[PDB]
Design a protein around this ligand. Sequence first.
Ligand code: FMN
Ligand code: FMN
Lengths: 105, 105
Amino acid sequence: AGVVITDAQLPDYPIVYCNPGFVQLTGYPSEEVLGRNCRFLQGPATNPETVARLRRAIHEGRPAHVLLLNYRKDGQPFWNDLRIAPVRDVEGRLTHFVGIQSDVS
Amino acid sequence: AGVVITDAQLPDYPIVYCNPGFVQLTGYPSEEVLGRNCRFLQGPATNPETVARLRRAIHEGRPAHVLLLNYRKDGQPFWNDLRIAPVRDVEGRLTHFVGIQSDVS
Ligand SMILES: Cc1cc2nc3c(=O)[nH]c(=O)nc-3n(C[C@H](O)[C@H](O)[C@H](O)COP(=O)(O)O)c2cc1C
Ligand SMILES: Cc1cc2nc3c(=O)[nH]c(=O)nc-3n(C[C@H](O)[C@H](O)[C@H](O)COP(=O)(O)O)c2cc1C
């Protein structure tokens, strides 16, 4: 599965890490992912109601679990079984979010 | 795959998060994982040289990728394809580690 960790302090929530699984899934190299928001995987047939629900959860700092349509680098679509979860530190401060993508096409 | 996030500030490196995939893999519920170190998955046939190499990387704050034998709750063994990676914050401070377990038995 793809595993990404976005910095939840800077605005826009950039990716600061992606495993090899996420590079095989989407087809993007680690150098074209780091620093960008994971919304680049969306496209013309991505359901906006699923995305809106996902952006509310991220903005409220709560976990999420959705099924939205994404698009590899080659432009081929795939069902993405995304699962978001908020990470906090020792003194109770949101620092990161962990995402877990799984292809269920 | 199993995904865990250990707090890298407190000593011992406790688990502060584990996805459902990690609960299906190991067979331990989320309530018996949180607060413990992921070394509870080791057993009598776990190669100590692989574990020592893993503890050096964690202590040096560097990524790792090993293949050690673990044990589910039921006592059944499995090849664990572990992949460790260090997480840092905005002002360059190690806060967490992300682990990715995959069964390759
Ligand atoms: C950690 C994390 C991982 C995300 N992964 C994905 C993803 O894999 N695919 C996707 O379409 N959106 C993903 N998102 C959603 C976007 O980051 C963004 O929050 C969403 O598109 C809504 O924001 P917007 O309405 O401003 O575009 C992820 C968000 C976070 C915080
Ligand atoms: C984030 C993270 C995840 C880990 N996951 C596992 C695991 O799934 N299985 C395992 O046998 N050891 C795992 N370890 C290794 C132990 O946490 C520990 O570092 C290792 O057993 C060496 O420490 P020790 O020699 O003091 O026991 C993980 C370590 C970290 C930091």
